[PDB]
Enzyme design. Structure first.
Site, PDB file in Angstrom:
ATOM      1  N   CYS A 114     -36.000 -44.981 -33.522  1.00  0.00           N
ATOM      2  CA  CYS A 114     -35.408 -44.811 -32.201  1.00  0.00           C
ATOM      3  C   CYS A 114     -36.606 -44.990 -31.260  1.00  0.00           C
ATOM      4  CB  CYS A 114     -34.759 -43.423 -32.048  1.00  0.00           C
ATOM      5  SG  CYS A 114     -35.696 -42.011 -32.687  1.00  0.00           S
ATOM      6  N   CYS A 128       4.098 -50.524 -21.625  1.00  0.00           N
ATOM      7  CA  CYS A 128       5.430 -50.433 -22.218  1.00  0.00           C
ATOM      8  C   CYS A 128       6.125 -49.340 -21.409  1.00  0.00           C
ATOM      9  CB  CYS A 128       5.378 -50.077 -23.719  1.00  0.00           C
ATOM     10  SG  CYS A 128       4.327 -48.700 -24.260  1.00  0.00           S
TER      11      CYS A 128
END
Length: 566
Positions: free
Chosen positions: A216, A503
């Site tokens: 990292c 919908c």
């Protein structure tokens, strides 16, 4: 071990989380170490952080370049895995001067996978330097690095390289997996995304690979998390147990502050609890038929089918302030469905209009990109202007409608678009340009113009009209074709905004659309299907995605269909 783990997590989490703190601060390998090599004058410029060194007893030693002092040094340490010493390598994000050394460690340790747990730049600060070629091939010290391919997905990126060490004929393959979904501040909300990432890394790390090198920034925080989680996953698989405290303690005995924050220690507990609870629900495509067969049967100590229990477990696993505001009461079609604050699609306010920033819609992540979809309810006469405002503001030029305007004697959706003559919604004049009525769906084209500046865009609406007014499609054949048309048209006309899908409440039929959009393509490129994780993940972005078990079953039926079409 699930209940145990969940229980253990309960007491540590109790009282402002007192016992977690006590346990975390108690981590102590109880040893005295040295790091002369890390502090040699020749090696100090090789450390990203002066307070982050490598213990001499566990450091990864590079072969020496005779006649050159300090040439055997790199800021990295071996980290023990489940039942195997030095199973990983934890290192810092390389610096411009240690780039050649980094690739040399990769070659020497026979590493086949590099795991990057950071973005190059976070908060405008440099966390790691880019140590790979953005294109072609470059030479870093004694190693030739050739970038072969890059695949960018929603939560991570995979880069495939070819390696050559000048002076030898051997060519090796190296795959870098970069996790892009870790927050700038703190740890990730849910462990699902990192868990998936962990899964892919494992699937792609060959059986004869040397230790993966993980890094990292300082190579202690996020790196420590990925490694401890990966080791524990391998353990609960072979022993159905898990010892997080003991492993972190062993890690710290090999390197500087592995798992550097208490919050990271908790995230690790949460991530493994979800993994133990959900298990691995992914199946290779070629096993889809068989899998669906078993899902249709009743397991040993059960009463209903495995399919019903899987769906039911999707539930079993107040961010609604805006939606619940009195001024927004009639802006919701079906009140049991409201957007989560975190992912709600926000709109620019309008002076004097209460809740003008609200629309019942949520941003959902797709396969290759985040916020690839906007899941929303069928517009109401009251929110039609807000709908068009949302499309322009968020650059969505592709609309997917999954209902008829009316079904079963009631309204499912208000006709928010003009049919004959042009119409203006706020600042946007919409001109109907074309309507193609097909056997199973309709495609409408609109020219939308901002009257303020005369700028315009072409909006394409796809309305599937073959969804049964009761139940779900039998085969899913026509729906799969529909999904392909929508996305093909989007890429064709190079439209880069999100796809707006609606919908009734934007969770049921909309859920099948988005779920299949993701699953069908992933099956095409990865040869696997994970219905459970897909729906589980969408549900953290909008509640109830894929509302009924019969819609869930159709998702499986349709994937099998598509699979056979190859």
């Amino acid at each position: 071990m699930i209940t145990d783990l969940a229980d253990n997590i309960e007491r540590l989490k109790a009282n402002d989380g007192l016992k977690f703190s006590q346990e975390y601060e108690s981590i102590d390998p109880g040893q005295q170490f040295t790091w002369e090599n890390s502090n040699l004058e020749v090696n100090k410029p090789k450390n990203r952080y002066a307070n982050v060194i490598a213990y001499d007893h566990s450091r990864v030693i590079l072969t020496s370049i005779d006649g050159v002092p300090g040439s055997d040094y790199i800021n990295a340490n071996y980290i023990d895995g489940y039942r195997k010493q030095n199973a990983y390598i934890a290192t810092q994000g390389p610096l411009p001067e240690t780039m050649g050394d980094f690739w040399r460690m990769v070659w020497e340790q026979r590493t086949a996978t590099v795991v990057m747990m950071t973005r190059l730049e976070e908060k405008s600060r440099v966390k790691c330097d880019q140590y790979w070629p953005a294109r072609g091939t470059e030479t870093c010290g004694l190693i030739q690095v050739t970038l072969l391919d890059t695949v960018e997905l929603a939560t991570y990126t995979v880069r495939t390289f070819a390696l050559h060490k000048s002076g030898s004929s051997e060519k090796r393959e190296l795959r870098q997996f970069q996790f892009m979904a870790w927050p700038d501040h703190g740890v990730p909300e849910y462990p699902t995304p990192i868990l998936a990432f962990l899964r892919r890394v494992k699937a792609c790390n060959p059986l004869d690979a040397g230790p993966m090198v993980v890094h990292c920034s300082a190579g202690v925080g996020r790196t420590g998390c990925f490694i401890v989680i990966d080791a524990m996953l391998e353990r609960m698989k072979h022993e159905k147990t898990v010892d997080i405290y003991g492993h972190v303690t062993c890690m710290r005995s090999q390197r500087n502050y592995m798992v550097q924050t208490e919050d990271q220690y908790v995230f690790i507990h949460e991530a493994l609890l979800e993994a133990a609870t959900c298990g691995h629900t992914e199946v290779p495509a070629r096993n889809l038929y068989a899998h669906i067969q078993k899902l249709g049967q009743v397991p040993p100590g059960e009463s209903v089918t495995a399919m019903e229990l899987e769906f039911k477990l999707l539930a079993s696993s107040s961010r609604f302030i805006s939606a619940n505001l009195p001024c927004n009461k009639f802006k919701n079609r079906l009140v049991n469905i409201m957007p989560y604050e975190l992912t709600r699609v926000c709109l620019q306010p309008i002076r004097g209009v209460e809740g003008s920033d609200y629309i019942n819609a949520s941003f959902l992540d797709g396969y290759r990109q985040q916020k690839a979809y906007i899941a929303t309810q069928g517009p109401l006469a009251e929110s039609t202007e807000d709908f068009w405002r949302m499309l322009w503001e968020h650059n969505s030029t592709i609309i997917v409608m999954l209902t008829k305007l009316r079904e079963m004697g009631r309204e499912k959706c208000h006709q928010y678009w003009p049919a004959e003559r042009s119409a203006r919604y706020q600042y946007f004049v919409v001109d109907p340009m074309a309507e193609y009525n097909m056997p199973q769906y309709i495609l409408r084209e609109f020219k939308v113009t901002d009257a303020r500046d005369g700028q315009s865009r072409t909006i394409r609406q796809f309305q599937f009209t073959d969804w049964p007014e009761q139940g779900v499609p039998k085969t899913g054949e026509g729906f799969i074709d529909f999904i392909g048309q929508v996305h093909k048209t989007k890429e064709q006309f190079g439209q880069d905004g999100p796809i707006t899908v609606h919908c009734s409440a934007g969770v049921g039929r909309t859920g099948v659309f988005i779920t299949l959009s993701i699953v069908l393509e992933r099956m095409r490129y990865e040869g696997v299907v994970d219905m459970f994780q897909t729906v589980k993940t969408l549900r953290t972005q909008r509640p109830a995605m894929v509302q009924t078990e019969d819609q869930y079953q159709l998702c499986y039926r349709a994937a099998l269909e598509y699979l056979g079409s190859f």
